[PDB]
Structures are given as structure tokens and as C-alpha cells.
Amino acid sequence: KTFKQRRTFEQRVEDVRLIREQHPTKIPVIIERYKGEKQLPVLDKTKFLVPDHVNMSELIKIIRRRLQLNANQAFFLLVNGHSMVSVSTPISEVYESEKDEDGFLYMVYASQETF
């Protein structure tokens, strides 16, 4: 069901290997919902494209926008199994940090910080 199951590693690798410079700037991101997350809506479009100078803040803002709720209920974005103590990090440095072997930067979201 997750994007790694729907696209093979090879397929993913050629997705990343070029959508990369038909938006040379941009960085590819798969945002999915935590499987055991009972309290949050499932937004569907998995594959996202983001501008680089952008920090995690704004990304959290837009995902908080397509999720239709009010900024006043807990939202957290984890990157791999790992995530920010700093929301001011540009998505570029985050990308160079936590990117997957297939070239996509993976993120999962929840109303809680659980394991």
C-alpha cells in the first residue's frame, strides 16, 4: 500500500533520477500517513515536489492545510524513523541528511510522536 510497495526500487530510482532536473531546483518527497495513526485524515497525493530553500516549517504548514484542520491540534512529521528537533532546517540539508537509498526523501505524519 505504501509508495515503496507500489513502485519497485528500480522504478523509484528512475523517478528520482530524473524528475530531479526537469525541476533541477526541486526535491522529491513522499509524505504518507503513519499506519497506526487513528486520529488523522489520510490526505492522498503521496508524491510531492518541493522548492529547496524551503524549511520544514512551511512544509508542515501546507500539509497542515490540505489536512483541513486548525493549527491547534498536534501534528508531527517524522523523516524515516528519525526527525527534527529543528524545524528551521532547509529541506535541502534535510534531504542530503536523511534521503533514502532510492533518492526520494521519505516522511510520515501523525498526531503523536510514537515509535
Binding site: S57, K61, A71, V85, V87, S88
Partner: protein, 405 residues
């Protein structure tokens, strides 16, 4: 873009001007309040949060535990740790009101329908009670045949002993100023009503009349005759007396009172007690559900960062709204300096709450404003929250959250 959600809402919401007498869901910080400024049912209810705080002068947790059930509507149940005594504290209600006529020739006046409803419910609970119980209801009494009447704080207690099936009313009354008039007293040449005792006792008898119960001696226990108090203070005495009644009832001792057993009024309502009351009302932001939570589970309510923010918004609103006498050869910070510091701090705290992060120049600005944040009334507010948030200071509060460079 710049502002996304710097919005102060949800738990950072400060109620608006027109929501001022209409909001029962939340008791907001009133940062200019003082004991002298009086009570209403919302402040009283707010004060109830002190009972299970182990650091409060009002802590009950040694005397009572919480009732396992909720047998009495509108009331918080408690079981004595030293007794078989169950103790019920009615949640304060603005409709608990009795009017009386000052003129003895007129009738005794009236009791609000909700108060009479409560008396009936107490009676119906007693008819089924297998255990000695105490019921504590705060209320107010007012003269209805004079103009310019004052609503006078007062407290009702009823005990029920199932063995003798006896039900004993008592009213604790902290005497306020002008709760009596020599002019009236002289004009009526002594037949004069200064209290709701007549209609209230009639009410209680009307409530128990169909049952097996005997009515005990009705007592009005009055205190602070001359310690001559504003109406305002009397509410604080009421709260103190709620405390005394609960403890005395759980220890099964006579309720002791200024003028009977207490040597002075401020040995009773103590400067520590006053600071507790004042700090609760001025500096805290508390839900009704949170208070019901505390009282029904028997636990403290820890101060939350959002309360610090909301308190700051209230101090800010008050000073920006008003126009002070602007005086001369002035030692200390100007209004403008203080409001700039408050606004800075609100922004920083809200950034910490939402983003869990603070820019280093932000921290630098804060550091520049800290002395002004620490000064006078504002200083007392900040110090309350620093203390209860477990921080030695603004710097040491904010600093784990700053991103350097």
C-alpha cells in the same frame, strides 16, 4: 510571507471584551484583581483548584479522599480519611441567591428556585443516606426593599446524622461594611432584617417537611464584626471557611472561626492564604473541565506554558486599553517599554509552544528585555509562572529552545 500561525487561540485564547460576563467554560487570568476587588461564582470555582495542590495553604488531601461515586448533582463528593463523614461541596453558582426585606413588617423575601432545588436534592439524598454527611453551599444574600443593595457573600452548611435522622443548618457570615445601618435600625426602632435567615430557614423546613427528619438548631455564625471589611474581602473569607468546614468536618471537630477559636482574622485568612488566592485568580487560566477533573480525581493541576502566554496577553490588554495618569520624575519603566517587552515575550513563548524553537537574535532581544520583564507587577506575574514552570529564569526557561548561528 511572514505570519502564518502566530494566532493566539485554543489554549492561548484570551476571551474578548464582550465575552466578559458570558464565559463559563474558562476562567481567564485577571491580572489586576486583588482580594479587595471581590468575588463571583466563577472566581470561587477557580479557587477550588487549590484543594488538591499539596503546596497550597488550602490543601485538603490529608483530611479527605475523593468519593468513588457522584451521588450528589452539582456537588463534589469527598470521604473523610479520619471519619465515616462524607462531605459534599457544591460548585458555586450565580443563582444561589436569597433576597430578603429589611422591613420586618414585610414578608421574609425569597430564595432563588435553583437554591431551593438544591435544598430538596439534599433532603432526598439524606433520606437514603446510611452515612453521616456534610453539605457545603456558597451563596449570596441581598436586601430587596432598599435601593443600592449589596450582594453579600455567605456560606451554608447542613449536616445529616442518620442515627438521629437529624439535619442541622448553619450559616457562616463574614461581616462586611454597611451590612447594617443605624438609620434603618433606628427608624424601624429595632425590627429590622439584616440577613436572609428567616426565608432560608423556612426554605429548609419546606424542603424536609415530608420526611422523618428533625431540624437541628439553626445557627448563624458571624465573624469579623469590627475587622471592618469591604464586601470584597468577605469572599476570600468564604473560601477560607469552605476550607475550615471541610477539614473540621473530616477531623470531626467543631468548626473554628475568627471570634470563636481563632485569635485574629489574619490568623484565619493568612497572608499566605491571600497570596494563594490572588495568584490563582490573577495568574492562571483554567478550564471548568480541568477543575472538575482535579476535584473528581483528587489531583493538582500543573501550570501550563499556555497559561503564562494568556496571562501576558491579559496584562498587555489591560495596559493598552487604558489611560494612566502619567506622572512626573518617574523612577522605573514606562508603559511603552513594558508593553514592548510583553509583546516580545508572548511572541517568543508562542514560538516555543508551536515550533519548539527560537532564533538566536530572538534570544538576544529577550535578554535585552528581561530586567523590564522582571520589574514590578509584571515581574510578579512572570515570577509566578517561572516558578511553576520549574524555571530559574526567563533565560533558563527559553534557552534549551534556541537555535544558534
Amino acid at each position: 510571507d511572514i505570519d502564518e500561525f502566530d494566532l493566539l487561540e485554543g489554549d492561548e485564547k484570551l476571551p474578548g471584551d464582550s465575552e466578559l460576563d458570558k464565559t463559563t467554560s474558562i476562567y481567564p487570568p485577571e491580572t489586576s484583581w486583588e482580594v479587595n476587588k471581590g468575588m463571583n461564582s466563577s472566581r470561587l470555582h477557580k479557587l477550588y483548584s487549590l484543594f488538591f495542590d499539596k503546596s497550597s495553604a488550602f490543601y485538603l488531601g490529608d483530611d479527605v479522599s475523593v468519593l468513588e461515586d457522584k451521588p450528589l448533582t452539582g456537588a463534589y463528593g469527598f470521604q473523610s480519611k479520619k471519619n465515616d463523614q462524607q462531605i459534599f461541596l457544591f460548585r458555586p453558582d450565580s443563582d444561589y441567591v436569597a433576597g430578603y426585606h429589611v422591613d420586618a413588617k414585610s414578608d421574609a423575601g425569597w430564595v432563588n428556585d435553583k437554591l431551593d432545588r438544591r435544598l430538596s436534592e439534599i433532603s432526598e439524598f439524606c433520606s437514603k443516606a446510611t452515612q453521616p454527611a456534610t453539605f457545603i453551599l456558597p451563596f449570596v444574600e441581598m436586601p430587596t426593599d432598599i435601593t443600592k443593595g449589596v450582594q453579600h457573600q455567605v456560606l451554608l452548611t447542613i449536616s445529616y446524622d442518620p442515627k438521629s435522622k437529624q439535619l442541622t443548618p448553619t450559616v457562616y457570615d463574614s461581616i462586611g461594611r454597611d451590612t447594617y445601618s443605624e438609620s434603618l435600625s433606628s427608624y424601624f426602632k429595632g425590627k429590622y432584617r439584616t440577613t436572609c435567615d428567616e426565608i432560608l430557614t423556612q426554605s429548609i423546613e419546606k424542603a424536609i417537611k415530608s420526611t422523618d427528619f428533625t431540624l437541628g438548631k439553626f445557627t448563624r455564625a458571624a465573624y469579623n464584626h469590627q475587622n471592618r471589611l469591604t464586601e470584597g474581602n468577605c469572599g476570600s473569607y468564604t473560601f477560607r471557611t469552605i476550607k475550615e468546614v471541610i477539614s473540621s468536618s473530616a477531623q470531626g471537630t467543631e468548626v473554628k472561626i475568627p471570634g470563636s477559636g481563632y485569635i485574629t482574622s489574619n490568623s484565619y485568612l493568612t497572608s499566605q492564604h491571600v497570596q494563594d488566592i490572588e495568584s490563582c485568580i490573577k495568574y492562571r487560566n483554567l478550564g471548568v473541565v480541568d477543575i472538575e477533573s482535579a476535584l473528581t480525581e483528587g489531583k493538582t493541576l500543573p501550570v501550563q506554558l499556555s497559561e503564562f502566554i494568556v496571562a501576558l496577553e491579559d496584562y498587555g490588554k489591560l495596559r493598552s486599553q487604558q489611560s494612566e495618569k502619567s506622572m512626573l520624575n518617574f523612577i522605573g519603566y514606562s508603559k511603552t517599554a513594558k508593553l514592548t517587552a510583553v509583546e516580545l515575550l508572548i511572541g517568543i513563548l508562542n514560538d516555543i509552544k508551536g515550533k519548539n524553537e527560537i532564533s538566536e537574535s530572538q534570544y538576544d532581544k529577550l535578554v535585552k528585555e528581561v530586567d523590564c520583564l522582571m520589574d514590578s507587577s509584571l515581574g510578579k506575574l512572570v515570577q509566578f509562572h517561572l516558578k511553576n514552570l520549574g524555571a530559574e529564569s526567563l533565560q533558563k526557561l527559553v534557552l534549551p529552545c534556541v537555535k544558534f548561528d
